[PDB]
Design a protein around this nucleic acid. Structure first.
Lengths: 69, 115, 79, 217, 69, 125
RNA sequence: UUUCUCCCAGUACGAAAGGACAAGAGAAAUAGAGCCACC
């Protein structure tokens, strides 16, 4: 489904790493929330829609967890 | 701005506001010592035959210098408990509401668009 | 590197994940058919395996592993 | 020789000494903050310190629609449509909280006041906030945009059709018949064009101001 | 030019003579203690005053643009 | 002084189940940090809200004035506006419904933004 | 000129529940007297 599923694994791995790098927030919920986010959206998508979802995640990945602090 | 009558645009996702209705949403009361209602002033709006408090976020009345004059009157619905009726606000909302006296953090949190 | 050590550790990390049912958690346990694993399951299983052994596994061949022994071989030859 | 509007004093009983003192402060401030030359219709981006925010500046881009005030209190208004909302902000030239002034596009419009643009179509008033500055020619007059904007239905803020307004940038023909213009022309007051009691000349004052401003430099 | 800058409005038209005296409000009961008690005498010329006198809060022109930091 | 790190540690001490903190870039003219907090019950929400304000007043902030508490009347959403951070405290279930974190984390991509709808307001005649 | 909020202070007081003063600050409102830098 995705343009490249390798990004999904790499993207998900980075999100988990950011959770361990996130101090002010509660580490507990973030891990669960990210897992829920991946399950709800990525499982069923179209190529064009999937591109937006992964693209926003890449910016989310590359922007200090998209402002999460 | 919004005052007695003064049909306003309901900038909210509240069910009553979101649902189209044949009569425009007007105001019945201004929750201020003065009779004039401006941005940040609570009002008693009317929606779908119901009376719901609304918070003014924009007005067409000429304002002070260095401020943007809105071309439409925009309001945000607020519940009796003080929480906003709607979970999101679409029109850009001025950030001066934070410094304005009153409880505006809830509405600002619900307002993603800030100008 | 110890091939036996990787196999038990690879099996151990597979056992750690709770969602998958280790009814038959053999060294040749298949994912699509033996365990009925969806795309989400295989992704997460690689994540657990990746964390233990220093990740650096790309999904280009990870989805092709389809069993713990195959990744054991992939882990063994990449270290 | 471009003499900025604020320097020109208006007719009245105000003391000339006030203008002399005001001009000196204006010249002193101009050194700290450079005020670029611009006219109504030019698109400008101005950087100003944000009071609500802490240590954060903001830049707003819009077409200049009106110039008002004189001296240190002179202000300029620029208009733009943001998120589909027409917004006009009045900026005081000499306010200490204006960090920088950038003229993204220096140009002039058919009319000296662009209040009718509110009655015009949104596209004529829409401008990209992030649009980069375009090149300008120093030894030339500012480009004059002669495009005639199209109006919205007849109900307007003001009766632009009336001869007194004399708006030359409106496509009246499309929305107004020639008979309607004649009805508007009933308020011509032709003697007003020939009446010398309503004339105020600042040419001599403008010329005198030029040397004084240059001398301070 | 012997020009005093006073907050607020003053009744009358421009160029109209006015009478100025020290504030009689209770709060400013004794302000003449730190001011010239009889008056300021330029004849003495103990120390020449600056041409323009500013209040501390007042922002003088030619100062750096005020940033709300 | 009262800063971001102290408050969140105080939030942990009073056992805040879920805390969200979003920084704001200089371009956006809002508070530098936006904070969202979860609390099991309205009694817990009242207790934690009071604790942070009491610590804030005690922890220097002399230059800053006292901070009024907003939303105490509501049993599901309490928000306190501090000098450098705003903490929005709510129940866990209320947290998902509002999804304040999505609004700030996804500045323009938040799902609830699309949920807003438009209307028409014709005259009677 | 009048009202409201804050501060004083969750203090004084009180077993607790609960909860002040005075002094100070900020908001408005109206009345009176004015003013045109801006709108």
């Amino acid at each position: 489904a995705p343009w490249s599923r390798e990004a999904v694994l790499c993207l998900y791995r980075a999100l988990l790493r950011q959770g361990r790098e996130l101090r002010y927030t509660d580490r507990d919920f973030y891990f669960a929330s990210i897992r829920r986010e991946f399950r709800k959206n990525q499982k069923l998508e179209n190529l064009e829609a999937r591109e937006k979802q992964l693209e926003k995640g890449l910016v989310f990945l590359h922007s200090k967890l998209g402002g999460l602090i | 701005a919004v005052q007695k009558m003064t049909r306003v645009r309901v900038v909210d996702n509240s069910a009553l506001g979101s649902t189209p209705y044949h009569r425009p949403p007007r105001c019945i009361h201004v929750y201020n010592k003065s009779g004039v209602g401006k941005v940040g002033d609570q009002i008693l709006l009317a929606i779908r035959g119901q009376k719901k408090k609304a918070l003014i976020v924009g007005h067409r009345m000429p304002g002070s210098r260095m401020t943007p004059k809105f071309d439409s009157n925009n309001v945000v619905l607020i519940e009796d408990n003080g929480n906003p009726v709607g979970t999101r606000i679409k029109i850009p909302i001025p950030t001066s509401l934070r410094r304005r006296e009153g409880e505006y953090s809830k509405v600002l949190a619900i307002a993603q668009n800030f100008v | 590197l110890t091939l036996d050590g990787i196999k038990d550790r690879v099996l151990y990390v597979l056992k750690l994940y709770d969602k998958i049912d280790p009814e038959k958690l053999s060294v040749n346990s298949h994912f699509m058919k033996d365990l009925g694993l969806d795309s989400l399951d295989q992704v997460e299983i690689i994540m657990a395996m990746e964390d233990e052994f220093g990740f650096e596994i790309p999904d280009i061949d990870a989805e092709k592993l389809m069993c713990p022994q195959e990744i054991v071989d992939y882990i063994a030859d990449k270290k | 020789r471009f003499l900025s509007p604020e320097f020109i004093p208006p007719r009245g009983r105000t003391n000339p000494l006030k203008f002399k003192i005001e001009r000196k402060d204006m010249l002193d401030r101009r050194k700290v903050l450079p005020i670029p030359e611009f006219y109504v219709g030019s698109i400008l981006r101005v950087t100003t310190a944000d009071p609500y925010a802490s240590g954060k500046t903001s830049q707003f881009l819009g077409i200049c629609i009106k110039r008002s005030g004189n001296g240190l209190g002179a202000t300029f208004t620029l208009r733009n449509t943001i998120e589909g909302q027409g917004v006009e902000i009045c900026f005081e030239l000499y306010n200490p909280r204006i960090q920088e002034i950038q003229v993204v596009k220096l140009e002039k419009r058919l009319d000296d006041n662009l209040l009718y643009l509110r009655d015009a179509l949104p596209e004529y008033s829409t401008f990209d906030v992030n649009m980069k500055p375009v090149p300008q020619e120093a030894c030339q007059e500012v480009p004059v945009n002669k495009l005639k904007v199209k109006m919205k239905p007849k109900p307007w803020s003001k009766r632009w059709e009336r001869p007194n307004f004399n708006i030359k940038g409106i496509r009246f023909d499309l929305a107004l018949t020639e008979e309607q213009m004649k009805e508007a022309q009933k308020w011509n007051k032709p003697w007003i064009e020939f009446d010398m009691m309503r004339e105020y000349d600042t040419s001599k004052i403008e010329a005198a101001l030029w040397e004084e401003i240059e001398a301070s430099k | 030019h012997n020009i005093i800058y006073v907050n607020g409005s003053v009744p009358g038209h421009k160029n109209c003579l006015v009478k100025i005296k020290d504030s009689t409000l209770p709060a400013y009961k004794d302000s003449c203690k730190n001011l010239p008690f009889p008056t300021y005498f330029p004849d003495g010329d103990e120390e020449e005053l600056p041409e323009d006198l500013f209040d501390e809060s007042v922002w003088q022109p030619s100062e750096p643009s005020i940033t709300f930091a | 002084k009262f800063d971001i790190d102290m408050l969140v540690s105080l939030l942990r001490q009073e056992n805040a189940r879920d805390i969200c903190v979003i920084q704001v870039p200089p371009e956006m003219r809002y508070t530098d940090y936006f904070v969202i907090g979860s609390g099991t019950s309205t009694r817990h929400l009242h207790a934690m809200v009071h604790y942070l304000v009491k610590m804030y007043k005690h922890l220097k902030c002399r230059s800053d004035p006292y901070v009024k508490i907003e939303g105490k009347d509501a049993d599901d959403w309490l928000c306190v506006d501090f000098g450098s951070m705003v903490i929005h405290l709510m129940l866990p279930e209320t947290r998902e419904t509002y999804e304040l974190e999505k609004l700030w984390t996804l500045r323009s991509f938040d799902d609830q933004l699309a949920q807003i709808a438009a209307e028409t307001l014709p005259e009677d005649f």
